[PDB]
Amino acid sequence: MIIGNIEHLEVWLPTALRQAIEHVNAHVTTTTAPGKYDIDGDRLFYMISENMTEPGESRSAEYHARYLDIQIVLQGQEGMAFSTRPAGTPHTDWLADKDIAFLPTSVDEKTVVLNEGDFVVFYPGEVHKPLCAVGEPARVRKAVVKMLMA
Amino acid sequence: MIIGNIEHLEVWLPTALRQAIEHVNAHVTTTTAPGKYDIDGDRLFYMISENMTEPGESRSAEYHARYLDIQIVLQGQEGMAFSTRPAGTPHTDWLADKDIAFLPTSVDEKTVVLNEGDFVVFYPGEVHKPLCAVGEPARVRKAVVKMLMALEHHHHHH
Numbered sequence A: 001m002i003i004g005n006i007e008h009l010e011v012w013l014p015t016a017l018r019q020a021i022e023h024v025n026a027h028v029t030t031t032t033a034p035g036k037y038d039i040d041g042d043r044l045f046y047m048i049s050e051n052m053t054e055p056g057e058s059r060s061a062e063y064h065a066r067y068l069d070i071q072i073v074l075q076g077q078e079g080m081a082f083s084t085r086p087a088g089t090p091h092t093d094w095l096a097d098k099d100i101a102f103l104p105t106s107v108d109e110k111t112v113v114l115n116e117g118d119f120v121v122f123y124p125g126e127v128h129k130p131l132c133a134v135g136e137p138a139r140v141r142k143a144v145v146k147m148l149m150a
Numbered sequence B: 001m002i003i004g005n006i007e008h009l010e011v012w013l014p015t016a017l018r019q020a021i022e023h024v025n026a027h028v029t030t031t032t033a034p035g036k037y038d039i040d041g042d043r044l045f046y047m048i049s050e051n052m053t054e055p056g057e058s059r060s061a062e063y064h065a066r067y068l069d070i071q072i073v074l075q076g077q078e079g080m081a082f083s084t085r086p087a088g089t090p091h092t093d094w095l096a097d098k099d100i101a102f103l104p105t106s107v108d109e110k111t112v113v114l115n116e117g118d119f120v121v122f123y124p125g126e127v128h129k130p131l132c133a134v135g136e137p138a139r140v141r142k143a144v145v146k147m148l149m150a151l152e153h154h155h156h157h158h
Protein backbone atom coordinates (compact mmCIF):
# COMPACT_ATOMS: atom_id res chain seq x y z
CA MET A 1 0.00 0.00 0.00
CA ILE A 2 1.14 3.64 -0.49
CA ILE A 3 0.52 6.59 1.86
CA GLY A 4 0.91 10.24 0.93
CA ASN A 5 -0.79 13.64 0.88
CA ILE A 6 -2.67 15.11 -2.10
CA GLU A 7 -1.26 18.63 -1.70
CA HIS A 8 2.27 17.25 -2.12
CA LEU A 9 2.46 14.75 -4.98
CA GLU A 10 5.97 13.42 -5.56
CA VAL A 11 7.61 11.68 -8.49
CA TRP A 12 7.71 8.47 -6.46
CA LEU A 13 3.95 8.15 -6.90
CA PRO A 14 3.19 6.28 -10.16
CA THR A 15 2.38 8.90 -12.77
CA ALA A 16 -1.10 7.56 -13.57
CA LEU A 17 -2.01 7.88 -9.89
CA ARG A 18 -0.53 11.37 -9.60
CA GLN A 19 -2.63 12.44 -12.59
CA ALA A 20 -5.81 10.96 -11.12
CA ILE A 21 -5.31 12.80 -7.82
CA GLU A 22 -4.60 16.03 -9.67
CA HIS A 23 -7.88 15.50 -11.50
CA VAL A 24 -9.70 15.16 -8.19
CA ASN A 25 -7.90 18.23 -6.85
CA ALA A 26 -8.85 20.30 -9.89
CA HIS A 27 -12.52 19.31 -10.10
CA VAL A 28 -13.81 18.44 -6.62
CA THR A 29 -15.15 21.21 -4.35
CA THR A 30 -16.90 21.09 -1.00
CA THR A 31 -20.21 21.29 -2.93
CA THR A 32 -19.60 18.21 -5.10
CA ALA A 33 -22.41 15.82 -4.28
CA PRO A 34 -21.91 12.14 -3.42
CA GLY A 35 -21.69 10.07 -6.57
CA LYS A 36 -19.60 8.71 -9.42
CA TYR A 37 -17.49 11.01 -11.57
CA ASP A 38 -15.61 10.37 -14.78
CA ILE A 39 -11.97 10.54 -15.75
CA ASP A 40 -11.19 7.88 -18.39
CA GLY A 41 -13.97 5.40 -19.13
CA ASP A 42 -13.85 2.29 -16.94
CA ARG A 43 -10.07 2.63 -16.64
CA LEU A 44 -10.13 5.61 -14.26
CA PHE A 45 -13.01 7.20 -12.36
CA TYR A 46 -13.78 8.34 -8.84
CA MET A 47 -16.51 8.40 -6.20
CA ILE A 48 -17.34 11.12 -3.70
CA SER A 49 -18.90 9.97 -0.45
CA GLU A 50 -19.74 11.17 3.05
CA ASN A 51 -20.34 8.71 5.88
CA MET A 52 -20.15 8.32 9.62
CA THR A 53 -17.14 6.34 10.78
CA GLU A 54 -17.85 3.26 12.85
CA PRO A 55 -15.92 1.04 15.28
CA GLY A 56 -13.53 -0.95 13.13
CA GLU A 57 -14.57 -4.18 14.82
CA SER A 58 -18.11 -3.66 13.44
CA ARG A 59 -17.14 -3.68 9.71
CA SER A 60 -15.72 -6.34 7.45
CA ALA A 61 -12.50 -5.78 5.55
CA GLU A 62 -12.46 -5.90 1.74
CA TYR A 63 -10.23 -6.48 -1.25
CA HIS A 64 -10.52 -6.20 -5.02
CA ALA A 65 -9.22 -8.23 -7.95
CA ARG A 66 -9.11 -5.78 -10.87
CA TYR A 67 -9.21 -2.21 -9.52
CA LEU A 68 -6.70 -0.27 -7.47
CA ASP A 69 -8.17 2.20 -4.95
CA ILE A 70 -6.91 5.65 -4.04
CA GLN A 71 -8.63 6.63 -0.77
CA ILE A 72 -8.47 10.44 -0.27
CA VAL A 73 -9.72 12.22 2.86
CA LEU A 74 -11.39 15.49 1.85
CA GLN A 75 -12.78 16.46 5.26
CA GLY A 76 -12.64 14.80 8.65
CA GLN A 77 -10.48 12.16 10.33
CA GLU A 78 -10.52 8.52 9.23
CA GLY A 79 -9.09 5.32 10.66
CA MET A 80 -7.83 3.23 7.74
CA ALA A 81 -7.27 -0.41 8.71
CA PHE A 82 -5.37 -2.84 6.48
CA SER A 83 -3.23 -5.98 6.37
CA THR A 84 0.24 -6.42 4.91
CA ARG A 85 -0.49 -10.10 4.17
CA PRO A 86 -2.65 -11.77 1.50
CA ALA A 87 -6.38 -12.00 2.15
CA GLY A 88 -7.84 -14.80 4.25
CA THR A 89 -11.05 -16.63 3.37
CA PRO A 90 -13.86 -14.19 2.43
CA HIS A 91 -17.35 -14.62 3.79
CA THR A 92 -18.63 -12.85 0.65
CA ASP A 93 -17.02 -13.23 -2.79
CA TRP A 94 -18.49 -10.90 -5.43
CA LEU A 95 -15.24 -10.50 -7.36
CA ALA A 96 -16.66 -11.55 -10.72
CA ASP A 97 -19.79 -9.40 -10.54
CA LYS A 98 -18.62 -6.40 -8.52
CA ASP A 99 -14.81 -6.74 -8.05
CA ILE A 100 -15.16 -6.95 -4.26
CA ALA A 101 -14.86 -9.59 -1.56
CA PHE A 102 -15.53 -9.10 2.14
CA LEU A 103 -13.83 -10.95 4.95
CA PRO A 104 -13.40 -10.80 8.72
CA THR A 105 -10.77 -8.69 10.45
CA SER A 106 -7.32 -10.27 10.27
CA VAL A 107 -5.22 -11.06 13.33
CA ASP A 108 -2.47 -8.82 11.91
CA GLU A 109 -4.66 -5.79 11.11
CA LYS A 110 -2.97 -2.37 11.36
CA THR A 111 -4.55 1.09 11.44
CA VAL A 112 -3.29 4.46 10.21
CA VAL A 113 -5.12 7.69 11.04
CA LEU A 114 -5.80 9.80 7.94
CA ASN A 115 -6.48 13.53 8.11
CA GLU A 116 -7.58 16.01 5.46
CA GLY A 117 -5.58 15.62 2.27
CA ASP A 118 -3.99 12.30 3.26
CA PHE A 119 -4.41 9.42 0.80
CA VAL A 120 -3.72 5.67 0.70
CA VAL A 121 -3.32 3.47 -2.37
CA PHE A 122 -4.44 -0.18 -2.23
CA TYR A 123 -3.58 -2.40 -5.19
CA PRO A 124 -5.72 -5.46 -6.02
CA GLY A 125 -5.46 -8.07 -3.28
CA GLU A 126 -4.47 -5.57 -0.58
CA VAL A 127 -6.90 -5.99 2.32
CA HIS A 128 -8.36 -2.76 3.64
CA LYS A 129 -11.13 -1.48 5.91
CA PRO A 130 -11.99 2.22 5.50
CA LEU A 131 -14.11 4.51 7.68
CA CYS A 132 -12.98 3.18 11.07
CA ALA A 133 -13.82 5.45 13.98
CA VAL A 134 -11.05 7.39 15.72
CA GLY A 135 -12.69 7.98 19.06
CA GLU A 136 -16.33 8.90 18.68
CA PRO A 137 -17.97 8.20 15.29
CA ALA A 138 -17.91 11.27 13.07
CA ARG A 139 -18.46 12.20 9.45
CA VAL A 140 -15.72 11.75 6.86
CA ARG A 141 -16.02 13.10 3.31
CA LYS A 142 -13.74 11.29 0.87
CA ALA A 143 -12.87 10.69 -2.74
CA VAL A 144 -12.09 7.15 -3.85
CA VAL A 145 -10.28 6.84 -7.18
CA LYS A 146 -10.61 3.51 -8.98
CA MET A 147 -8.03 2.53 -11.56
CA LEU A 148 -8.26 -0.65 -13.62
CA MET A 149 -5.07 -2.70 -13.42
CA ALA A 150 -3.73 -4.32 -16.60
CA MET B 1 5.87 5.74 1.54
CA ILE B 2 5.13 2.05 0.90
CA ILE B 3 4.11 -0.56 3.48
CA GLY B 4 4.25 -4.32 2.88
CA ASN B 5 5.62 -7.62 4.18
CA ILE B 6 8.81 -9.34 3.05
CA GLU B 7 7.10 -12.74 2.78
CA HIS B 8 4.60 -11.44 0.20
CA LEU B 9 6.33 -9.44 -2.53
CA GLU B 10 3.56 -8.60 -4.95
CA VAL B 11 3.49 -7.47 -8.58
CA TRP B 12 2.82 -3.89 -7.46
CA LEU B 13 6.14 -3.45 -5.70
CA PRO B 14 8.77 -1.77 -7.92
CA THR B 15 11.13 -4.40 -9.30
CA ALA B 16 14.30 -2.94 -7.78
CA LEU B 17 12.69 -2.90 -4.33
CA ARG B 18 11.56 -6.50 -4.74
CA GLN B 19 15.06 -7.59 -5.79
CA ALA B 20 16.68 -5.85 -2.82
CA ILE B 21 14.30 -7.53 -0.34
CA GLU B 22 14.88 -10.86 -2.10
CA HIS B 23 18.59 -10.41 -1.44
CA VAL B 24 18.00 -9.69 2.25
CA ASN B 25 15.75 -12.75 2.50
CA ALA B 26 18.40 -14.98 0.91
CA HIS B 27 21.48 -13.69 2.76
CA VAL B 28 20.40 -12.65 6.26
CA THR B 29 19.95 -15.29 8.93
CA THR B 30 18.61 -14.80 12.43
CA THR B 31 22.30 -14.88 13.51
CA THR B 32 23.75 -12.30 11.08
CA ALA B 33 25.68 -9.81 13.18
CA PRO B 34 24.96 -6.06 13.20
CA GLY B 35 26.89 -4.15 10.57
CA LYS B 36 26.93 -2.93 6.98
CA TYR B 37 26.53 -5.39 4.11
CA ASP B 38 27.00 -4.22 0.53
CA ILE B 39 24.91 -5.62 -2.31
CA ASP B 40 26.23 -3.28 -5.02
CA GLY B 41 28.81 -1.13 -3.23
CA ASP B 42 27.41 2.18 -2.10
CA ARG B 43 24.66 2.06 -4.73
CA LEU B 44 22.84 -0.64 -2.73
CA PHE B 45 23.58 -1.95 0.75
CA TYR B 46 21.88 -2.82 4.00
CA MET B 47 22.50 -2.37 7.71
CA ILE B 48 21.64 -5.00 10.32
CA SER B 49 20.92 -3.51 13.73
CA GLU B 50 19.58 -4.46 17.17
CA ASN B 51 18.39 -1.38 19.03
CA MET B 52 16.01 -0.58 21.83
CA THR B 53 12.90 1.37 20.92
CA GLU B 54 12.35 4.79 22.54
CA PRO B 55 9.24 6.97 22.94
CA GLY B 56 8.86 9.11 19.84
CA GLU B 57 8.03 12.36 21.64
CA SER B 58 10.72 15.05 21.60
CA ARG B 59 12.98 12.88 19.40
CA SER B 60 13.96 13.99 15.90
CA ALA B 61 12.62 12.82 12.55
CA GLU B 62 14.88 12.64 9.49
CA TYR B 63 14.94 12.51 5.72
CA HIS B 64 17.42 11.80 2.95
CA ALA B 65 18.29 13.42 -0.36
CA ARG B 66 19.60 10.54 -2.48
CA TYR B 67 19.04 7.19 -0.73
CA LEU B 68 15.72 5.42 -0.53
CA ASP B 69 15.21 3.39 2.67
CA ILE B 70 13.65 -0.05 2.93
CA GLN B 71 13.13 -0.58 6.69
CA ILE B 72 12.48 -4.25 7.52
CA VAL B 73 11.56 -5.59 10.95
CA LEU B 74 13.40 -8.89 11.34
CA GLN B 75 12.42 -9.58 14.97
CA GLY B 76 10.22 -7.62 17.36
CA GLN B 77 7.71 -4.79 17.16
CA GLU B 78 8.52 -1.24 16.07
CA GLY B 79 6.59 1.99 16.00
CA MET B 80 7.34 3.70 12.67
CA ALA B 81 6.53 7.41 12.79
CA PHE B 82 6.38 9.49 9.63
CA SER B 83 4.86 12.53 7.91
CA THR B 84 2.87 12.58 4.70
CA ARG B 85 3.94 16.19 4.08
CA PRO B 86 7.27 17.63 2.90
CA ALA B 87 9.93 18.29 5.50
CA GLY B 88 9.80 21.44 7.60
CA THR B 89 12.82 23.31 8.87
CA PRO B 90 15.63 21.05 10.12
CA HIS B 91 17.81 21.66 13.11
CA THR B 92 20.70 20.02 11.22
CA ASP B 93 21.25 19.74 7.46
CA TRP B 94 23.90 17.18 6.48
CA LEU B 95 22.20 16.29 3.19
CA ALA B 96 25.02 17.06 0.77
CA ASP B 97 27.78 15.24 2.66
CA LYS B 98 25.97 12.57 4.71
CA ASP B 99 22.54 12.32 2.98
CA ILE B 100 20.59 13.18 6.14
CA ALA B 101 18.74 16.12 7.69
CA PHE B 102 17.22 16.03 11.17
CA LEU B 103 14.13 17.90 12.25
CA PRO B 104 11.71 18.16 15.17
CA THR B 105 8.47 16.20 15.22
CA SER B 106 5.86 17.52 12.81
CA VAL B 107 2.37 18.52 13.92
CA ASP B 108 0.99 15.87 11.56
CA GLU B 109 3.20 12.92 12.61
CA LYS B 110 1.62 9.48 12.11
CA THR B 111 2.65 6.11 13.48
CA VAL B 112 2.17 2.59 12.10
CA VAL B 113 3.06 -0.48 14.16
CA LEU B 114 5.39 -2.90 12.35
CA ASN B 115 5.83 -6.55 13.35
CA GLU B 116 8.09 -9.36 12.15
CA GLY B 117 8.44 -9.28 8.38
CA ASP B 118 6.74 -5.93 7.83
CA PHE B 119 8.61 -3.32 5.81
CA VAL B 120 8.25 0.33 4.91
CA VAL B 121 9.83 2.23 2.03
CA PHE B 122 10.78 5.91 2.28
CA TYR B 123 11.83 7.72 -0.89
CA PRO B 124 14.16 10.73 -0.59
CA GLY B 125 12.40 13.65 1.08
CA GLU B 126 9.96 11.44 2.99
CA VAL B 127 10.11 12.30 6.69
CA HIS B 128 10.42 9.35 9.06
CA LYS B 129 11.27 8.47 12.65
CA PRO B 130 12.07 4.80 13.24
CA LEU B 131 12.37 2.82 16.46
CA CYS B 132 9.46 4.37 18.38
CA ALA B 133 8.34 2.42 21.42
CA VAL B 134 5.05 0.53 21.38
CA GLY B 135 4.23 0.27 25.05
CA GLU B 136 7.39 -0.57 26.96
CA PRO B 137 10.72 -0.03 25.17
CA ALA B 138 11.87 -3.32 23.66
CA ARG B 139 14.58 -4.58 21.33
CA VAL B 140 13.96 -4.65 17.58
CA ARG B 141 16.24 -6.40 15.08
CA LYS B 142 16.11 -4.67 11.69
CA ALA B 143 17.52 -4.55 8.18
CA VAL B 144 17.65 -1.10 6.57
CA VAL B 145 18.34 -1.17 2.83
CA LYS B 146 19.84 1.99 1.32
CA MET B 147 19.32 2.31 -2.42
CA LEU B 148 20.73 5.12 -4.54
CA MET B 149 17.96 6.73 -6.58
CA ALA B 150 18.02 8.32 -10.01
CA LEU B 151 17.96 12.11 -10.40
CA GLU B 152 14.18 12.27 -10.83
CA HIS B 153 13.68 10.89 -7.29
CA HIS B 154 16.13 13.16 -5.48
CA HIS B 155 14.85 15.41 -2.71
CA HIS B 156 13.74 18.92 -3.72
CA HIS B 157 13.51 21.89 -1.37
CA HIS B 158 10.51 23.47 -3.13
Ligand SMILES: [Zn+2]
Pocket: A062, A064, A069, A128
Ligand atom coordinates in the same frame (compact mmCIF):
# COMPACT_ATOMS: atom_id res chain seq x y z
ZN1 LIG C 1 -11.83 -0.66 -1.74
Ligand SMILES: [Zn+2]
Pocket: B062, B063, B064, B069, B122, B128
Ligand atom coordinates in the same frame (compact mmCIF):
# COMPACT_ATOMS: atom_id res chain seq x y z
ZN1 LIG D 1 16.26 6.89 6.96
